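Run: sequence + fe (iii) ion -> complex structure.
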Amino acid sequence: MFTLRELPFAKDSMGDFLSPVAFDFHHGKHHQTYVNNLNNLIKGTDFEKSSLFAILTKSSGGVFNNAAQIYNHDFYWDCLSPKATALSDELKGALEKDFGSLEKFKEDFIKSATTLFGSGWNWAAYNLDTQKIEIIQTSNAQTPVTDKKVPLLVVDVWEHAYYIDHKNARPVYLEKFYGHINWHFVSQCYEWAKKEGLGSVDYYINELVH
Amino acid sequence: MFTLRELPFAKDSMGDFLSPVAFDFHHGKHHQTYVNNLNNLIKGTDFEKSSLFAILTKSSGGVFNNAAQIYNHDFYWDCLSPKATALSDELKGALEKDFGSLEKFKEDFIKSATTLFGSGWNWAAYNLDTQKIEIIQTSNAQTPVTDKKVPLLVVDVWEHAYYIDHKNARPVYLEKFYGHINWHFVSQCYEWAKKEGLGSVDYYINELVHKKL
Ligand SMILES: [Fe+3]
Ligand SMILES: [Fe+3]
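>> structure
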């Protein structure tokens, strides 16, 4: 049984992007609800004492939906920062190699998050076999982790993530999101994806959050 | 070449269920956008001069997403009424038969609409082979029509359909929706589903909603 993580920044620290109320609802209610739903669903089952990483990579159905949503949001929050941070030279190099330039990566990342139809998530994930960074869009609760890929960056595109401050204007929301990307954290994720592979995710969930 | 349908009621007629602003965005922007997207996507293609029913039942990809979303919303708007209207004796009989009672149908319909995960629609559709009314949930833009079934009632559960007035409280939104069901329209759909089958859908789209001028 898990507990909702603390937001890694103050609710009023990103006024050009999300408002305190947006956070109250997204984190305080939606995220909270996924935590409570998982706890209630695993009670008396094979996962009642399993780690989130365990449940995430092994479960399915509702248990998965909730487990994954808890992970996706936790990851999403860490991808955000009040103030801009710099990219590690390795991440920068990797992005320019796999995308041509940082500007092209942005363009590709945003366009992909713009066209994702219905509820979902838009990721930048490290492929272990290809050793390349891919821009992947997943629907509803899915996450690249179940495809053996390591999340480096993600933006929530479920409408509840931006309707309060932006209504239907997802593009504006995306542009504001990009400006607040916690490159420092994206850099960490990359470095460890290369060193521990999918194991870095395990560590993240268990040693960095839950 | 399509144009956004007129809302079948006043934007301020839906009490605490849907507010005028909610309508400005849902109909005025989301629905409007699917119309504009489809028009732009078919320009210069095989579907350029096709009817919505045609495109809806034959296309796929983005063309389908937009085509279906146009239909789904059109249908959704007609399922709403400033005040709940009456059920035809046939529809009532049919619902009691396939669900036990109206109250049980409500219970089942609402529960199915409540658990549908992610974006989607919650329908009550007539099965032509079984001649039974089924409660079906579809994801994103899908609609029973592609499974040869006739929509009788639907509720939009994409979050944009209720976030403005209800935020995350889909259940409250669903309970309010139910109180505004245009049974008169649901009855029409049923009668014609039995008489013209999937053809009633064709007529609905081409003849009474998107009649070119
Ligand atoms: Fe979310
Ligand atoms: Fe809608």
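>> summary
The domain at 82-210 of chain A is CATH 3.55.40.20 (minor pseudopilin epsh fold). The first strand of chain A starts at residue 120 and ends at 127.
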